Symmetry: C2
Subunit: 130 residues, 2 copies
């Protein structure tokens, strides 16, 4: 649902997709479980709400609702950068200094009706006064 | 359509809605015309593509596709802040303090298909190798 603050009404959902670097069977068993754990922890750190998270052997698909203060690029790099540091630190057998490739996919999600927009306008005028 | 930057593939659409501060008949005639002009210029300046823009007497509804480097809140405050400066400068009678209220509505938009995501994943593995 739409979230609010003193001066903002928002609903920002994004699909983030990225892949491990060397092998397609990287995120499995304990590695995959820890990856899910750290991504969840990073989400709460950023005040984000995970809608759905697929941690597959060869890719991650993170669908999350986030505060408007964050740029998609900032979020992608925070999730990828911090998770990589933690995951590589925990599993020594994981190769090289990089876990993820530098690329990622991001797509906004949502459908705003004319009714939602009209309601918002009327609420602001009711609030601010005419 | 989906776009691509240095290391990303993205679709970032946002709906922004905000209202003028004092009167519901603020954005009319020359003022409304100039407002539409400056908002379009700011979009161009930021590398954003306007999908739809309604400049009504009592509100602005800006639906835009933007680069992932921008936070929704930065966009709202820049579009609002720079347009206000330019509008207040061209129309001295808008004196009466701030042009806009400090609030705004922002919501992401999009319905990306699984085929697009699947293609992205395969393209990354084709480029990365295994």
């Amino acid at each position: 649902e739409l979230k609010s603050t003193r001066h903002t009404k928002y609903l920002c959902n994004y699909h983030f997709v990225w892949i491990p670097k060397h092998r397609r069977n990287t995120l499995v068993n304990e590695i995959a479980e820890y990856t899910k754990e750290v991504l969840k922890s990073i989400a709460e750190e950023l005040g984000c709400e995970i809608i759905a998270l697929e941690v597959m052997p060869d890719h991650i698909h993170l669908f999350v609702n986030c505060p408007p203060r964050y740029a998609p690029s900032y979020l992608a790099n925070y999730f990828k950068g911090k998770s990589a540091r933690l995951i590589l630190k925990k599993f020594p057998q994981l190769n090289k200094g990089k876990l993820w490739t530098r690329s990622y996919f991001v797509a906004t999600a949502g459908n705003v009706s004319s009714e939602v927009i009209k309601k918002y306008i009327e609420e602001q005028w009711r609030k601010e006064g005419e």
